[PDB]
Every structure is written in C-alpha cells, then in structure tokens.
Amino acid sequence: MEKKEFHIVAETGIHARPATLLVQTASKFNSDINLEYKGKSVNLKSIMGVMSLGVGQGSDVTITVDGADEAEGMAAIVETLQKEGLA
C-alpha cells in the first residue's frame, strides 16, 4: 500500500477540470485508490464522491493506493497533481 499527504494550493481546490482529470487518472488503475479529507474517505475513482468532499485551497488531504499496480498509480497521481496545479 502507498500513501501520500498533499497540500492543495489550487484556487478552486479539488473541483472543476482538475478534479475531473484527477478522477480520470485514478480510474486507469486496478489498485484501490482513496482520497481522505477531514477524516472522511472517498473512492478517488468516483466523481460524485470527490466533488462532494468539498476540498478547497489550503486543504490537507491524503491519497492511498493499494493494489498490484499501486506504484504506477501513485506516480501518475503525483504527476497529474503537478500538471493540473493542484499540489
């Protein structure tokens, strides 16, 4: 299992295009991927769950990846977060 805590710097937080893109990236992997914010964990592959979490700028979140391709998944997540200006 891999886990990483990020600090959201984006103006919109995890919403709009960056959120949709992050969700799409997560969905490409077989591993289970969860996003935790304020003690609440959702499936990062689910758009409704992510959008409803209410993650704004300045938020501290933790992403957990668990599965065969977890290493590949974490690497892609970090890249996406950087290119979408999220963390």
Side-chain angles (χ1 to χ4, degrees):
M1 182 185 282
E2 295 203 19
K3 172 172 170 171
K4 178 69 189 307
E5 202 188 278
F6 304 87
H7 180 81
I8 307 310
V9 298
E11 190 193 311
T12 55
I14 302 176
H15 291 99
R17 196 167 179 271
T20 304
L21 257 285
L22 217 199
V23 175
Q24 293 176 167
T25 295
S27 301
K28 300 171 183 61
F29 309 104
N30 186 246
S31 297
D32 285 333
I33 305 174
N34 291 261
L35 171 65
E36 183 168 25
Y37 169 61
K38 291 191 307 187
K40 192 187 304 78
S41 182
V42 303
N43 179 186
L44 191 52
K45 298 178 186 177
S46 194
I47 190 70
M48 184 195 290
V50 171
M51 296 307 280
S52 298
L53 206 54
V55 182
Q57 181 181 64
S59 295
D60 152 46
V61 301
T62 298
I63 295 175
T64 298
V65 187
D66 184 29
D69 60 5
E70 63 187 37
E72 188 189 5
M74 182 60 83
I77 294 298
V78 178
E79 159 215 61
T80 297
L81 289 171
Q82 185 170 206
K83 79 176 194 294
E84 299 304 325
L86 281 172

